[PDB]
Structure 1
């Protein structure tokens, strides 16, 4: 009944293929589909069915047992989390804004531009802006002199983020020089940034706090250290996105508070999010 959109980002949402011999998503996974175009000219395409698992998938399973709803999970195709591009929202935010999905689940950072057009769950994952450097690099945060005067260092201090998300907006809306310097170090994905950090091609990676803490926690060899931005103005959390004025915000929040109360949340946190390093 309920159309729910998600986005793949480990460890919160992990996407794998279905076994063709089964027609089944098994173990801890649930069925999720994707509308994939036939080529790069039309929008013509068809659904391909996949399997989805992760921390927020397990939250969705708990939510639809407790609130007692059935759902059809699908993966966003136009954009990622959410950005206003040419005055139209893309990503998961757009799917809720334009009422193609009743809910959006995943590593969706609650911010203030987004909550002008969608209603939000209570935060269930603490997040913000964090800085990750190679183990050995010493930075106090985003206010360090390597981030404010990068040309004082040889080579110039190399740091960047993943564009079009919650982190870039917080930098672009408040510190224009920092943002303009960063875009030449735009990192396409989390995995690319960690490779350049450990190989010495990047000095610092600015990104979401929850993702960076998880990646540093179970990194092969414990080579990555994460420190808070110090941008306390950007502290927030992941939230389930609902349509503006949604009648389900009340019951979705009540179920999440139950999980936080009875320990289901902390037990989910030690299944997916705990780390080993530091």
Structure 2
């Protein structure tokens, strides 16, 4: 997830990655029925969520080992079986799960979440220089215009797509000209003129609008927080860790040690 956790290559000659960076060998075991072993190349992860993980390891005194997941992005059950991060947590293949994970009522019935440490929601970034008033304007609600402002990004099988498909069936019906890749492809498609409005999470869009030549502007930011939620850590149902790390996280937000991470890891020019 581009500011939160970054995966790169190891040292040119050493292999022991940079200080203040956590080794993270991804599991690429796409087949084991007729496959011997997939070579787990030693990559090293760094970023914001990994920093929070380091602080938690120092405070609550545990040990860890990251491993990237290769079944879906975050999770959207395909008729009864989950996938991704929530899927791994539910089927007891992993004790915890950290990253860019949103809180809902769809999956909070299956796993156990922590007190949120990042504020997020839904936002609508527009092309350049407001033109729309959010999710209530007649353009988005009623797609029947001669000039049809079209194709909010809304990458498939995400969390915001669940909100759209649950509340307003009309928008989900019309919006089929989506993007098949992450915000990186959607923003350049918008910059080239494919689609003029991107509908996605809040923090990632705010960051991507912060780090840009010139800058592109979102709709009114203080009012561009629709269906507010937060990020969080997903753990197995009713484990004794929830009592501890929860409290730990709160301590951070009381002491401003999360505040400095905002300055270090999440800043822009514009």
TM-score scaled to structure 2, two decimals?
0.92
Residue 269 of structure 1 aligns to a residue in which SS?
helix
- Distance in structure 2 (CA, Å) of the matches to 1:227 and 1:78: 36
Contact 1:141 1:227 in 2 (8 A): no
**CA offsets, 1:103-152, max 9 Å, x none?**
10001111111111100010000011111111226221122222123331
Match of 2:230 in 1: 237
Contact in 2 for aligned 1:128/1:209 (Cα 8 Å): yes
Query: Does the CA-based 8 Å contact 1:17-1:51 persist in structure 2?
Result: yes
Residue of structure 1 equivalent to 2:4: 12
Where structure 2 has 5 or more consecutive residues not aligned to the other structure, the ranges are none
- With the length of structure 1 as denominator, give the TM-score of the two structures: 0.89
Q: Which has the higher strand share?
A: 1
Mapped pair 1:196 → 2:189: yes
d(CA) in 2 for partners of 1:257, 1:114:
23
The CA distance in 2 between the partners of 1:252 and 1:190, in whole Å, is: 31
Q: Contact 1:131 / 1:227 at 8 angstroms: preserved in 2?
A: no
Partner of 1:248: 241
Q: Is 2:8–2:44's contact at 8 Å kept on the other side of the alignment?
A: yes
Residues in 1 aligned to 2:117 and 2:228: alpha-carbon distance in whole angstroms: 13
Is 1:106 equivalent to 2:99 in the alignment?
yes
Q: Is the 8 A contact 2:151 2:177 kept in 1?
A: no
Specify which of 122, 132, 135 is matched with residue 129 of structure 1. 122
Q: Which moved more, 1:53-62 or 1:223-232?
A: 223-232
Q: Distance in 1 between matches of 2:241 and 2:95?
A: 9
Q: Which runs of 4+ in 1 moved over 3 A?
A: 41-44, 226-232
Matched positions, count: 267
CA contact (8 A) 1:15 1:50 kept: yes
Give the secondary-structure state (helix, strand or coil) at the position aligned to 2:235.
strand
CA distance in 1: counterparts of 2:114 and 2:30, whole angstroms: 36
Q: CA RMSD in A?
A: 2.1
Aligned to 1:166: 159
Query: In 2, Cα distance between the equivalents of 1:227 and 1:127?
Result: 15
